[PDB]
Amino acid sequence: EDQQHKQELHKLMARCFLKLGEWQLNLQGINESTIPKVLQYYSAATEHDRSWYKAWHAWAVMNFEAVLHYKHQNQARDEK
Q1: Which parts are the TPR repeats?
Q2: Backbone angles phi, psi at 27, to 5 degrees
Q3: DSSP H helices in the chain
Q4: Which residues participate in the annotated binding site?
Q5: Which has the closest alpha carbon to 18: 78, 74, 60?
Q6: Dihedral through CA 18, CA 24, CA 29, CA 31, nearest 10?
Q7: Which of 59-79 are b and which e, b meaning 16 or more Cβ less than 10 Å from the residue's Cβ?
Q8: 30: Cβ–Cβ under 8 A, 6 or more apart, which residues?
Q9: CB contact set of 44 (below 8 Å; sequence gap of 6+)
């Protein structure tokens, strides 16, 4: 009696966590709390969906960006 509502809410969950994951960097930029905030919001978005190209592709990009938070460790924190 709510399987469709469950599915649409499961999909909306991916969007809403991904939106926090985007919006967070948009509202404050970057410090070391990004690693938890992004790995959470975008993997938590991924928790619902992988086959939705955009939703995973955006977390995969964010995994490249979490990679780049540690490239930035090598390039800046370890060398400034």
Answers
A1: 1-52
A2: -90, -25
A3: 3-28, 34-48, 53-72
A4: 15
A5: 60
A6: -90
A7: beebbebbeebeeeeeeeeee
A8: 69
A9: 17
> Which residue in the block uniquely carries the two structure tokens 């599915």?
7
Q: Resolution, rounded to a tenth of an Å?
A: 4.7
Binding residues for 1D-myo-inositol hexakisphosphate: 15
Q: What is the CA radius of gyration of the chain?
A: 15
- Tokens standing for 57? 């592709």
Give the determination technique.
cryo-EM
DSSP code of residue 77: I
Backbone φ and ψ for 29, nearest 5 degrees, come out as 80, -125
